Paper text:
The inability of wild type FPOXs to act on intact proteins is the most critical issue limiting both their diabetes detection efficiency and their protein deglycation potential. This is due to their buried active site and narrow access tunnel, as determined in multiple crystal structures. In that account, using a rational design approach involving a five-amino acid deletion at the entrance of the active site and a number of further mutations, we described a stable PnFPOX mutant (named L3-35A) that, relative to the wild type enzyme, features a significantly wider and shorter access tunnel.
In the present study, we set out to enhance the thermal stability of the L3-35A mutant by implementing a methodological approach whereby different thermal stabilization strategies are tested in parallel and their efficiency compared. These various strategies involved mutations to either improve the RMSF of the protein (generating mutants hereafter referred to as D-series mutants), increase the number of salt bridges (C-series mutants) or form disulfide bonds (X-series mutants). The D02 variant, which relative to L3-35A features two additional mutations (V110R and D115G), shows an increase in Tm of ≈ 1.5 °C with respect to the parent enzyme. We observed that the activity of the enzyme variants towards fK and fV remained similar to that of the parent enzyme, with a slight increase of activity in the case of D02 and a slight decrease in all the other cases. Also, similarly to the parent enzyme, none of these mutants shows any activity towards the dipeptide or the hexapeptide. In this process, while the amino acids that are directly involved in the catalytic function were not modified, some tunnel-lining residues were replaced. This could explain the reduced activity of both the L3-35A enzyme previously reported and its thermally-stabilized mutants described so far (D02, C16, X01, X02A, X04, X07). At the structural level, the tridimensional architecture of all mutants reported herein is maintained, confirming that our mutagenesis campaign did not impair the conformational stability of the enzyme.
Author numbering: 3 to 426
């Protein structure tokens, strides 16, 4: 078929890469009624890693991230969800400071020197963030990124879902949206079947199932799914007013926090290598069950919280960043799932055996900032127009390294070994 006549199913279309793909199909002139978004949960999916009050907009010298940054500034659908507060990337101790100097030097060497400034003392840091405590940031240096800030993530995906609804995109959710298998005819994918038995037929299928991708089809451990954690504190209107338009504050050895949302709520994250949840599971294409990391979904198990070890790290972030708030209860604790490749690059490729089935995953914990742009690259993959360098960087690559460690400091620990999260 031609493009007005091409049917495409986006599996995981309630999440980050999937909603972006559906948007870029519509914007590229695919007929909205020929696009079907399938998700386990209605857009924005309650288990999407993008279903979050906030994410950091930390675009670097990377072409895709920079193209995304421009859309967060200029695109009429997205721009209202980007808060250009700036970002403090803070470092403490001999090794982290040396790595921050080098990151700074690299950004100068890459021609972003005008967007960033080196803060060489605590006085320089308190100038940009006077709500910090001088005592707790003794010896800290920072890169202040003027271009940075934070993204109203769940609101941005919701806004894509409302736009797609109004265009006449087709939806299937719950049993009617939860992918079970591809429909294959002589090695060609011609649609999908969901858990309730519903079949959808299309010319092309995109698997944008995030941390669920390696659970749904055999990916030969090129993606390993891991959880990260957050909790919330509630500020009085007077407390929240002191933090209005605060930059994002990050320290790789502490974690990070955001300015309060419109309800006075501050989200706090630690910084760590993520948690697996290994269990026996048989993805489509696997000859028998395998021990793989299967997300433990907060949407399916809303009584779940986070490990005790995670609460302690978040309390330490609050004690370091916001000592006056050590007494506030930490609430709406949740695990948030991503999938790492060995090299931390995306997995955006045609399936090597199932023609017209495409992977769009490998988010590796840092892809929410790509929400505006990433579906453009997926449409280019479907159309055969993706740049060779990106076709290689995002290629099918089992056996290319250990995704349990990936490019992080250590192999992820497992939730089986981390008490405090399960309240069943
Ligand atoms: C705590 C945390 C903090 C983060 N901070 C940042 C940050 O500051 N900046 C940044 O850029 N990135 C950040 N990230 C990373 C970012 O959130 C992810 O890289 C990105 O959102 C992943 O997008 P995705 O589309 O691959 O997955 P998702 O958005 O999770 O989408 C996957 C979708 O697949 C659906 N699905 C699952 N199973 C099925 C099925 N059987 N059938 C159909 N659909 C299914 C899910 O319901 C979901 O909607 C953070 C992530 C977490 C968890």
């Amino acid at each position: 078929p031609s493009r007005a006549n091409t049917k495409v199913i986006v599996v995981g279309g309630g999440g980050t890469i999937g909603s972006s793909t559906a948007l870029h199909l519509v914007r590229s002139g695919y007929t909205p009624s020929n696009v079907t978004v399938l998700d386990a949960y209605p857009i924005p999916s309650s288990q999407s890693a993008g279903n979050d009050l906030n994410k950091i907009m930390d675009a670097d010298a990377d072409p895709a991230a920079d193209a995304a940054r421009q859309m967060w500034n200029e695109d009429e659908l997205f721009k209202k969800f980007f808060h250009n507060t700036g970002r403090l990337d803070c470092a403490h101790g001999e090794k982290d400071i040396a790595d921050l100097k080098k990151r700074y030097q690299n950004l100068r060497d890459w021609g972003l020197g005008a967007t960033v400034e080196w803060l060489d003392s605590e006085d320089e840091i308190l100038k940009r963030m006077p709500q910090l405590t001088r005592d707790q940031i003794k010896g800290w240096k920072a890169i202040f990124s003027k271009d940075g800030g934070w993204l109203a993530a769940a609101k941005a995906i919701k806004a894509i879902g409302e736009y797609l609804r109004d265009q006449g995109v087709r939806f299937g959710f719950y049993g009617a949206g939860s992918f079970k298998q591809p429909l294959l005819a002589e090695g060609v994918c011609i649609g999908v079947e969901t858990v309730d038995g519903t079949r959808y037929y299309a010319d092309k299928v995109v698997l944008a199932a995030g941390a669920w991708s390696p659970t749904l089809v055999e990916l030969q451990e090129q993606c390993v799914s891991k959880a990260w954690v957050y909790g919330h504190i509630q500020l009085t209107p007077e407390e929240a007013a002191r933090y209005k338009n605060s930059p994002v504050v990050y320290n790789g050895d502490v974690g990070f926090f955001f300015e309060p949302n419109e309800h006075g709520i501050i989200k706090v994250c630690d910084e760590f290598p993520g948690f697996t949840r290994f269990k026996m599971h048989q993805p489509f294409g696997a000859k028998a069950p395998k021990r793989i990391s299967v997300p433990r979904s907060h949407a399916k198990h809303p009584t779940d919280t986070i490990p005790d070890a995670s609460i302690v790290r978040i309390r330490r972030a609050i004690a370091t960043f916001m000592p006056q708030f050590k007494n506030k209860p930490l609430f709406n604790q949740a695990m948030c799932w991503c999938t790492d490749t060995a090299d931390g690059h995306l997995l955006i490729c045609e399936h090597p055996e199932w023609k017209n089935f495409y992977l769009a995953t490998g988010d590796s914990g840092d892809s929410f900032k790509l929400l505006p742009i990433i579906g453009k690259y997926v449409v280019e993959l479907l159309e055969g127009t993706l740049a060779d360098e990106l076709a290689h960087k995002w290629r099918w690559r089992p056996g290319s390294g250990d995704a349990l460690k990936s490019r992080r400091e250590a192999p992820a620990k497992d939730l089986a070994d981390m008490p405090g999260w399960n309240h069943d």
